[PDB]
């Protein structure tokens, strides 16, 4: 009973820091949120 | 009866052997500081090192 | 070396190591250790590790204690 706020997927979900994104929709929106891939 | 004879590596020639595991060197006999013959050393060896040699007649050839 | 299996066989506490033998077993190289005695004599430990104290209270030798239970032995003087 926890899905992605973007797509509604039940798997690979990231609750860390309260994003509630799946591991794929996050990667799609990662830079927009402001997670810079410094390394 | 061979007598263990000492020599000194004057210089280093190459790294022979299939895997390169053999440094070829020129040795300087201490009893007679005139005999410069090729020998084949295993292990890290620079000039100024002293090789113990059981025999001496066994002489390495060029690019042996 | 059944030398914890031998700790109560009456030979031991009668004399076996009260100079019955262990005059000698240091004298192989004159102060051979508590553990060389422990295996240069085929008998091993803990009949010995009790007597490592016993000969010490008897004032025949001087001894050490440390980490691995390394312990030492001396003959005379």
């Amino acid at each position: 009973s926890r899905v992605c706020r973007v797509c509604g997927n039940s798997h690979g979900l990231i609750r860390k820091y309260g994003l509630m994104c799946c591991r794929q929709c996050f990667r799609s929106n990662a830079k927009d949120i402001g997670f810079i891939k410094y390394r | 009866d061979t007598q263990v004879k000492l020599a000194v590596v004057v210089k280093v020639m190459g790294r022979t052997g299939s895997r390169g595991q053999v440094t070829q060197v020129r040795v300087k006999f201490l009893d007679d500081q005139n005999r410069l013959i090729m020998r084949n050393v295993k292990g890290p060896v620079r000039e100024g090192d002293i090789l113990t040699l059981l025999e001496s007649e066994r002489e390495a050839r060029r690019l042996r | 070396g059944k030398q914890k299996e031998k700790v109560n066989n009456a030979v031991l506490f009668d004399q076996a190591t009260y100079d019955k033998l262990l005059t000698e077993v240091p004298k192989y190289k004159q102060i051979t250790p508590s553990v060389l005695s422990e295996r240069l004599r085929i008998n091993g430990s803990l009949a010995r590790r009790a007597i490592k104290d016993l000969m010490e209270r008897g004032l025949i030798r001087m001894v050490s204690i440390h980490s691995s239970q390394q312990i030492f032995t001396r003959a005379t003087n």
Partner: protein
Amino acid sequence: PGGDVKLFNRWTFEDVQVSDISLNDYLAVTSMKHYTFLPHSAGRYSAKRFRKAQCPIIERLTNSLMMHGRNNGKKIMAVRIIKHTMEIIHLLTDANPIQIIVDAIINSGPREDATRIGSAGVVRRQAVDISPLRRVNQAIYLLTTGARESAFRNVKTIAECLADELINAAKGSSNSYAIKKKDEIERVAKANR
């Protein structure tokens, strides 16, 4: 060489003489640069070639005691074994325990070996000389392994397995793992000359 500095603060480095001038260059014992209180130094050896020839030799012995996984890196334990070991050596020999080890390094290092070289276009093992630094490296290796194997599943302690090993090796008796492994290497190498 000058300096009254001693290992564990008990054993003098002067009055140790290394006979074979062949590897007198790589026994880091004799010169006053090599004297150290403890065989434990975090020196950046292995950084360059031949640099580990400068490591004090009692440390090189110590470094090799830490093998087979359950001993890797446990250097305080390894050095503590060394202290007990030299207690035992002077206990059994009443000579300079430093002399014993360096004589045990010098007697148990193979002077020859067989390597697969190819002359004329066909390869096979052929007889070769051994450089002094690998000889020291090999002399250490044989002693430590032999002491290791005997102590395993033995009531005897490692410190004293090491001690018997070094005493027998410095004498040169055919009683040490190092001695028998040395002579089988020479005999093979002699045959394939």
